[PDB]
Amino acid sequence: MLSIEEERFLDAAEYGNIPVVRKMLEECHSLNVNCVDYMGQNALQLAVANEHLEITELLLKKENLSRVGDALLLAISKGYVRIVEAILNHPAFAEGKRLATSPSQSELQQDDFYAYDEDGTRFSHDVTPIILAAHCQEYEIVHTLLRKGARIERPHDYFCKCTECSQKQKHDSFSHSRSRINAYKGLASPAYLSLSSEDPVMTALELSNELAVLANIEKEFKNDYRKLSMQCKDFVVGLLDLCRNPRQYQKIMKRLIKRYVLQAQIDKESDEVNEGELKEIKQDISSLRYELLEEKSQNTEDLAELIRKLGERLSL
Amino acid sequence: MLSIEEERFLDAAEYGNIPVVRKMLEECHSLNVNCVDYMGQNALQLAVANEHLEITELLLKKENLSRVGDALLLAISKGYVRIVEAILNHPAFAEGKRLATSPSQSELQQDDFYAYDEDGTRFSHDVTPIILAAHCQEYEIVHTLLRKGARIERPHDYFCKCTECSQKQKHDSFSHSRSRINAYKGLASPAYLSLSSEDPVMTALELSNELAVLANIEKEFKNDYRKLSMQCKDFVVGLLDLCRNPRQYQKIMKRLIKRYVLQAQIDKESDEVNEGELKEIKQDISSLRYELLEEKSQNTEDLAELIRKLGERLSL
Amino acid sequence: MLSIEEERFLDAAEYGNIPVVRKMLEECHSLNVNCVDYMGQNALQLAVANEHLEITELLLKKENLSRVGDALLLAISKGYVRIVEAILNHPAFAEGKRLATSPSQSELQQDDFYAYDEDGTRFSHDVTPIILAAHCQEYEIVHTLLRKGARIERPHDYFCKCTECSQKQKHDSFSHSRSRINAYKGLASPAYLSLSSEDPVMTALELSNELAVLANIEKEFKNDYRKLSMQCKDFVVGLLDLCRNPRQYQKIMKRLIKRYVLQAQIDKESDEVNEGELKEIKQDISSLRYELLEEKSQNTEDLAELIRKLGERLSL
Amino acid sequence: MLSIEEERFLDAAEYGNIPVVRKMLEECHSLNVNCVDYMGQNALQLAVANEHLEITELLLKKENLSRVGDALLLAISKGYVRIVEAILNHPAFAEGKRLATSPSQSELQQDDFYAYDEDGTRFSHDVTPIILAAHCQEYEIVHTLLRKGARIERPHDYFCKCTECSQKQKHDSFSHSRSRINAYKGLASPAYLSLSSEDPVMTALELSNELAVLANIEKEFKNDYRKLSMQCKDFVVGLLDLCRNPRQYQKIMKRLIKRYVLQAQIDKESDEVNEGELKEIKQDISSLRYELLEEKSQNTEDLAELIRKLGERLSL
């Protein structure tokens, strides 16, 4: 099943045995990168799912064997930012990986024998931030390149083929659950009020259909909350006048962008507390533990070298 | 009542005085392992109930005097995993201790003059994980050997004798509260839908009796939540078709196992916060405190040795 | 108002500048122990109210000037235990300070120009644990000596004089709010069911009066919760039989003591989280900060001494 | 967009790279203080909004380029105290900056191209503590100088001009939301009951107007809660008599000040937990990480110097 070195390396990747991870990796043994436990653990997914930044850095140093897609979906599926910046600095990125032109075949950084598929066999990596409304990740993605599928309503060329394949329409309502959350339309492309006011007529035309109804009604609710929240955070008369309707308009829009984003980040920081955040704090404490103890052992090794030098001097 | 060394050793076992625990244990005094305070504290139960992993390792190094049963029931009664792996690596385990063939007599790793009996004088150690739905501990136990009592409904050979003894039927309803929680039937033996659908008829036949009624009704509720939750996490048509009803079936079942286990672990990590987790964090901080301070004292001792060597050189 | 050394010493007593507290105290300046800020802060009350154990130890080393009563009432008014054990090891204790024979005059370890009076000008120190139901502090106190006022109902010798003085009857209902909470009657003196069943008739005789009514009704509720909770945690028939009514009786009573105390400590550890616990965690982190940084500065001082010795050797 | 040193300095100002902040600042490069990211981040606002006290100290050491107004509004908008004391020790303060005599023009320590305006283009810095009811900050401010606008009801000299300018009346109701919260009237100027009883007639005269009604009704509710809370915390008859109506009166008022402030601080410390406090704890852990690791690297540098000295001795 599992050798001794595999269990050492996997518990090291779990619990922040960072110098032990070093002394396992820089030894040239048959290290067997991508060892999987009873579930999909993959020795890197554990490092992402437990806030181990430098372990992910050391694993991305070895670009021989990896599974980067589930790693990025873990790092976005929770509120991590540093791990996302570490994963995006990789030669399988930087205008090498897009989302629009893609068949049903799987490949590198598309999960197969996955630990978990997030939400579908055809599922973009810019869909996970918007369902979670994580803003800074969308800054990073749209600053790279806006990754939106630009969904289409029945062209019937190859869309009818995928309609005849399987339950694609769940992914259709899911793709419309992309385009109307707070974070992307608060960051997409200017005159946000125009796009916000062109959404709910389209989702009511979706409500002409009768399959996924209440979800689209909730999307209309979210659009209404957007409109009211944009009407709330206004002080002077000109703010209200251009919320009702050149350079000053774009300045006022950027001001309301800043206000809505910062009040959304305040509203995220006034909630209850999940246990995963305490899991992250415990892993921080354990990483401090192993780093400080084994670098103190390195200090004792340097003192032993100095003692050997002094003993060689005293023997002389 | 208590000597000075006993109070030192007990507060050391409480609060993570790990090098003080070392300098007490490796001295060959009359150390009096298994000293008990005002309640059952036992100098090891404090280490388990306060997240002190290395103290439990050092105490399991001395296999002279111990009380392992309450230690394992503490380590499973809370969400500890490392302490469970430390306790199970012990010569009172590894196919040396089973659960089925057992009389009413107590023995080693069966608590007597206990700090606490968990739920009964005849109570298996694989019952505590399932009431708490801790998954990884059940992976470890069933990977050792599935430990289920395989309960029986009135054979009247010796079961009638224990019926005439005492209130065994509370333990009967308790033993049926084992077999229907999420974690074990999500991990027992394949075609989980068959076992889940054979449960509620049997618990309705229990509802023919009128002693413990609402508990069995709640078990039927939990089975219904299982069935609906298994119907939720499906995407393609074949998933729904084999949830409705060879190799592909077993693959689809393992996929749904992975999905349900990971969404259950996400649902555990989105709750409120008990104070015992902050107790664990405070004990982590205190363990860091004592480790770093007294190993820094060891560093000063090494520098004092180097100073004595340099003074002996300068005197020469 | 405040000199520079006073502000240094007060912020040191707040935030865990433990070696700075050392280098202020062991210097023989006019240190002015008991400096008070804008409110009652007293340079020791800050150490108690912010979890600074070693600072309280160093302040109790200097027994020249102090204010111990408010310190003990802070340490009991929150859930501290180590600070209580540190304060009780003091020559103003250990059968030197009692609670029954006491006039209205204030003295040492009775607060005057206090930061705060807890609940009254005549208020025992064993009343604060029972309102908070902190168990281990009551173990320590009753193990020293049970400190109960043994309240009396209208003797009219000097009780009528204090009745004619002021609103003593608020303290009368408060003194009856001592004697019926979970922790003391779970730890007072055996046959707890007898005392629990003799309480509510007496509090109904208090309900014959009409001043503080709903409080006494709530005390009767708490007594009912006690009786039902004692009826819950029973397994064998003999437990129920002696809960209904020699050596085995005392054994069964001690078993139910252990069970009720441990389930009460579990029920305390499953609640929501107040911000004061995070204040304690932040003060732990700051204490680690200042200890590790300034003892690392001591290590650099020792290395500078070794460098001076090596330079004196190389000059030779 | 951003150079390499700018990204290094900004992530250092975020995450507590305190010796890296030192080695960036004390190098005499074109460091570009006040670099702004995608939103207003300003390299100091990140240090304030993430609990980095020594980074704010090092940034206030360089008084060349700064933005102090948003820094103080961040430090007061959350519950920080040490950062407020660090910011107020600055030559743009100490009776150099007032609040009453001020036109509509912006200047130093008045935000422009701000990250965020808190509540208005004319908004005093003593308004943020009272809406948050932070007590110690108001002690510091009123101990400097009470900063209240002393609002006026229609003088029509220049007040009518600002009435004709814009929506000033939102700031009028906001300025009345200053003067009636718990913290300031619990700390303003004696006979608090007189001011508390002169408030609600004035806010009912505001309720003669019909624009902001329910807010003023809530202010009357808060005044009623004040009056009832002051009536609660009384024990002797004289306390009730002077709450109903010389030296003893002022003593009793100061006693009730102490009692109400300390019970308000207890009521703040019994709430649920926001995630921003865990953000502060994570930043404490990361600051400990970088400090201890890079000062341990300094210790290794000192040992390397000692090794070079010993090698020069052994070569001799």
Torsion-angle region of residue D124: left (phi > 0), alpha (psi -120 to 50) or beta?
beta
Query: Token pair 């900063």 is at which residue?
Result: D147
Report the distance separating Cα C140 and Cα C142, nearest Å.
Answer: 6
Report the distance separating Cα C293 and Cα C299, nearest Å.
Answer: 10
Query: Please, is C22 exposed, middle or buried when counting C-beta atoms within 10 Å of its C-beta (0-12, 13-18, 19+)?
Result: middle
Q: How far C15 CA sits from the closest chain D CA (Å)?
A: 11
Does residue A83 share a domain with residue A168? no
Report the distance separating Cα D296 and Cα A296, nearest Å.
Answer: 9
CB-based contacts of C272, cutoff 8 Å, min separation 6: B272, B273, D272, D273
In this structure, what token pair is assigned to residue B276? 């015992």
Report the distance separating Cα A211 and Cα A198, nearest Å.
Answer: 22
Q: How far D197 CA sits from the closest chain A CA (Å)?
A: 32
Flag whether B30 is in a domain: yes
In this structure, what token pair is assigned to residue B81? 């995993």
Q: Which of D38, D116, D306 is opposite residue A306, by nearest beta carbon?
A: D306
Q: How far D32 CA sits from the closest chain A CA (Å)?
A: 23
User: Which of C71, C87, C117 is at the close of a domain?
Assistant: C117
Number of domains forming the structure of chain B? 1
Decide: D128 and D76 in contact? Cβ < 8 Å.
Answer: yes
Decide: D290 and D17 in contact? Cβ < 8 Å.
Answer: yes
Query: How far lies B248's CA from each of A165, B194, B195, B241, B251, in Å?
Result: 19, 17, 20, 12, 5
Q: Check CB contact under 8 Å for C282 and D285.
A: no
Q: Which of C16, A54, A302 is nearest to D290 (CA)?
A: A54
Decide: D88 and D69 in contact? Cβ < 8 Å.
Answer: no
Cα dihedral across residues B254, B257, B263, B268: positive or negative? negative
Report the distance separating Cα C139 and Cα C124, nearest Å.
Answer: 16
Q: Which residues of A touch D301 (CB under 8 A)?
A: none
Q: Which of A120, A278, A282 is opposite residue B273, by nearest beta carbon?
A: A278
Decide: A88 and A144 in contact? Cβ < 8 Å.
Answer: yes
Instruction: For residue D96, give the DSSP letter.
Output: S
Interfacial residues of D (vs C; Cβ cutoff 8 Å):
139, 143, 235-237, 258-259, 261-262, 268-273, 277-278, 280-281, 284-285, 287-288, 291-292, 295-296, 298-299, 302-303, 305-306, 309-310, 312-313, 316
In this structure, what token pair is assigned to residue C201? 């008739």
Q: Check CB contact under 8 Å for B284 and A288.
A: no
Decide: D15 and D286 in contact? Cβ < 8 Å.
Answer: yes
Vertex B292: Cα angle to B287 and B296 (nearest 5): 150
In this structure, what token pair is assigned to residue D61? 């050491």
Report the distance separating Cα D182 and Cα D264, nearest Å.
Answer: 9
Q: How far B273 CA sits from the closest chain A CA (Å)?
A: 7
Q: Which of B255, C18, D55 is nearest to C9 (CA)?
A: C18
Q: Which of C111, C107, C102 is nearest to C77 (CA)?
A: C111
Decide: A63 and A100 in contact? Cβ < 8 Å.
Answer: no
In this structure, what token pair is assigned to residue D101? 């005599």
Decide: D147 and A212 in contact? Cβ < 8 Å.
Answer: no
Flag whether B144 is in a domain: no
Flag whether C290 is in a domain: no
Cα dihedral across residues C288, C291, C297, C302: positive or negative? negative
Query: Please, is B1 exposed, middle or buried when counting C-beta atoms within 10 Å of its C-beta (0-12, 13-18, 19+)?
Result: exposed
Q: DSSP characters for A143-177? A: HH--------S---SSHHHHHHHS--HHHHHHHHH
Instruction: For residue D125, give the DSSP letter.
Output: T
Query: In chain D, what is the straight-line distance between the N-terminal and C-terminal CA atoms, in Å?
Result: 55
Distance of CA C22 to the CA centre of its chain: 26
Q: Which residues of C touch B273 (CB under 8 A)?
A: 272-273
Q: Which of D115, D167, D275 is opposite residue A273, by nearest beta carbon?
A: D275
Does residue A93 share a domain with residue A2? yes
Report the distance separating Cα B12 and Cα B19, nearest Å.
Answer: 9
Which of D38, D46, D171 would best serve as a mutation to test chain A binding (most A beta carbons within 10 A)? D38
CB-based contacts of D153, cutoff 8 Å, min separation 6: none
H or E stretch at B315: helix B275-315
Interfacial residues of C (vs B; Cβ cutoff 8 Å):
139, 143, 235-237, 258-259, 261-262, 268-273, 277, 280-281, 284-285, 288, 291-292, 295, 299, 302-303, 305-306, 309-310, 312-313
Query: Token pair 């063939």 is at which residue?
Result: B101
Report the distance separating Cα B127 and Cα C302, nearest Å.
Answer: 57
Instruction: For residue B121, give the DSSP letter.
Output: S
In this structure, what token pair is assigned to residue B202? 């049997």
Decide: B115 and B42 in contact? Cβ < 8 Å.
Answer: yes
Decide: D59 and D47 in contact? Cβ < 8 Å.
Answer: yes
Does residue A263 share a domain with residue A137? yes
Decide: D24 and D7 in contact? Cβ < 8 Å.
Answer: no
Instruction: For residue D148, give the DSSP letter.
Output: -
Query: Please, is A22 exposed, middle or buried when counting C-beta atoms within 10 Å of its C-beta (0-12, 13-18, 19+)?
Result: middle
Q: Which residue of B has its CA nearest to C285?
A: B285
In this structure, what token pair is assigned to residue B236? 């393609």
Flag whether A311 is in a domain: no
In this structure, what token pair is assigned to residue D188? 């303003």
Q: How far B1 CA sits from the closest chain A CA (Å)?
A: 37
In this structure, what token pair is assigned to residue B190? 């394949």
Report the distance separating Cα B253 and Cα B192, nearest Å.
Answer: 8
Query: Token pair 């998954």 is at which residue?
Result: B135
Query: Please, is A60 exposed, middle or buried when counting C-beta atoms within 10 Å of its C-beta (0-12, 13-18, 19+)?
Result: middle
Neighbour subunits, D (≥3 Cβ pairs < 8 A): A, C
Does residue A163 share a domain with residue A68? no
Q: Which residues of D touch A236 (CB under 8 A)?
A: 121, 166-167
Q: Which of A18, A144, A135, A34 is nearest to A89 (CA)?
A: A144
Report the distance separating Cα A298 and Cα A302, nearest Å.
Answer: 6
CB-based contacts of C141, cutoff 8 Å, min separation 6: C126, C129, C147
Residue D96: CB atoms within 10 Å: 9
Query: Token pair 């049903």 is at which residue?
Result: A104
Indicate the SS3 state at residue A227.
helix
Does residue A62 share a domain with residue A12? yes
Cα dihedral across residues A79, A82, A87, A89: positive or negative? positive
Q: Check CB contact under 8 Å for D289 and A288.
A: yes
In this structure, what token pair is assigned to residue B31? 């150390």
Does residue C128 share a domain with residue C86? no
Side-chain-side CA neighbours of residue B284 (13 Å): 21
Q: Check CB contact under 8 Å for D276 and A270.
A: yes
Beta strands in B221-314 (DSSP E): none
Report the distance separating Cα C208 and Cα C139, nearest Å.
Answer: 34
CB-based contacts of C44, cutoff 8 Å, min separation 6: C13, C56, C59, C66, C67, C71
Q: Check CB contact under 8 Å for D307 and A312.
A: no
For residue B48, give the CATH number of its domain: 1.25.40.20
Q: Which of A235, A277, A303 is opposite residue D167, by nearest beta carbon?
A: A235
Q: How far C135 CA sits from the closest chain B CA (Å)?
A: 12
In this structure, what token pair is assigned to residue B310? 């340099």
Q: Check CB contact under 8 Å for A274 and B270.
A: yes
Does residue C150 share a domain with residue C262? yes
Q: Check CB contact under 8 Å for D261 and C115.
A: no
Decide: B137 and B126 in contact? Cβ < 8 Å.
Answer: no
Does residue C134 share a domain with residue C58? no
Instruction: For residue D257, give the DSSP letter.
Output: H
Decide: B4 and B29 in contact? Cβ < 8 Å.
Answer: no
For this experimental structure, what is the resolution in angstroms?
Answer: 3.8
Residue type, B93: F
Flag whether C189 is in a domain: yes
Q: Which of D258, D181, D257 is nearest to D221 (CA)?
A: D181
Q: Which of B66, B50, B52, B42 is nearest to B20 (CA)?
A: B52
Report the distance separating Cα D289 and Cα C57, nearest Å.
Answer: 28
Per-residue b/e over B52-68, b at no fewer than 16 CB within 10 Å?
bbebbebbbeeeeebbb
Flag whether A19 is in a domain: yes
What are the residue ranges of helices labelled H in D33-168?
45-48, 53-61, 68-77, 82-88, 128-132, 135-144, 159-165
Q: How far D21 CA sits from the closest chain A CA (Å)?
A: 19
Does residue C220 share a domain with residue C135? yes
Q: Which residues of D touch A306 (CB under 8 A)?
A: 303, 306-307, 310
CB-based contacts of D208, cutoff 8 Å, min separation 6: none
Query: Please, is C40 exposed, middle or buried when counting C-beta atoms within 10 Å of its C-beta (0-12, 13-18, 19+)?
Result: middle
Instruction: For residue A180, give the DSSP letter.
Output: S
Report the distance separating Cα A149 and Cα A172, nearest Å.
Answer: 11
CB-based contacts of C19, cutoff 8 Å, min separation 6: C290, C291, C294, C295
Contacts 24+ apart (CB under 8 A), B228-235: B229/B260, B230/B192, B230/B193, B230/B196, B230/B256, B230/B260, B233/B259, B233/B260, B233/B263, B235/A120, B235/A121, B235/A167, B235/A170
Q: Which residues of B touch C79 (CB under 8 A)?
A: none
Residue A108: CB atoms within 10 Å: 11
In this structure, what token pair is assigned to residue D77? 């908008």
Does residue C32 share a domain with residue C90? yes
Which of D18, D53, D236, D240 would best serve as a mutation to test chain C binding (most C beta carbons within 10 A)? D236
Q: Which of B77, B288, B282, A20 is nearest to B87 (CA)?
A: B77
Q: Which residue of C has its CA nearest to B168?
A: C236
Query: How far lies C293's CA from each of C25, D159, D295, in Å?
Result: 20, 56, 9
Distance of CA D98 to the CA centre of its chain: 16
Taking only Cα atoms into account, the Rg of chain B, rounded to an integer number of angstroms, comes to 25
Does residue A258 share a domain with residue A129? yes
Structural domain containing residue B43: 1-96
Q: Which of B182, B67, B66, B178 is nearest to B122 (CA)?
A: B178
What are the residue ranges of helices labelled H in chain A?
4-15, 18-25, 45-48, 53-61, 68-77, 82-88, 128-132, 135-144, 159-165, 169-179, 182-185, 192-207, 214-232, 237-244, 247-268, 275-315
Decide: A5 and A24 in contact? Cβ < 8 Å.
Answer: yes
Flag whether C303 is in a domain: no
Q: Which of A141, A228, A233 is nearest to A187 (CA)?
A: A141
Q: DSSP characters for chain C? A: ---HHHHHHHHHHHHT-HHHHHHHHSS-S---SS---SSS-TTTHHHHTTT-HHHHHHHHH--SS--HHHHHHHHHHTT-SHHHHHHHSSTT-SSS--SSS--S---TTS-SS-S--SS-SS--TTSHHHHHT-HHHHHHHHHH--------S---SSHHHHHHHS--HHHHHHHHHHHSSHHHHTTSSS-HHHHHHHHHHHHHHHHTSSSS-HHHHHHHHHHHHHHHHHHHS--SHHHHHHHH--HHHHHHHHHHHHHHHHHHHHHHTSS---HHHHHHHHHHHHHHHHHHHHHHHHHHHHHHHHHHHHHHHHH-
Helix axis angle for A18-25 and A53-61, nearest 10°, is: 10
Q: Which residue of C has its CA nearest to D303?
A: C303
Distance of CA A41 to the CA centre of its chain: 18
Report the distance separating Cα A28 and Cα D145, nearest Å.
Answer: 69
CB-based contacts of C276, cutoff 8 Å, min separation 6: C78, D269, D270
Per-residue b/e over C244-260, b at no fewer than 16 CB within 10 Å?
eeeeeeeebbebbebbb
In this structure, what token pair is assigned to residue B263? 């969404």
Q: Which residue of C has its CA nearest to B11?
A: C82
Q: Which of A288, A299, A310 is opposite residue D299, by nearest beta carbon?
A: A299
Q: Which residues of C touch D139 (CB under 8 A)?
A: 38
Report the distance separating Cα B87 and Cα B140, nearest Å.
Answer: 12
CB-based contacts of B52, cutoff 8 Å, min separation 6: B13, B16, B18, B46, B283, B287
CB-based contacts of A205, cutoff 8 Å, min separation 6: none
In this structure, what token pair is assigned to residue C33? 């122990």
Query: How far lies D179's CA from each of D149, D183, D188, D216, D222, in Å?
Result: 9, 9, 10, 12, 11
Does residue A224 share a domain with residue A184? yes
Report the distance separating Cα B275 and Cα B253, nearest Å.
Answer: 38
Flag whether A296 is in a domain: no
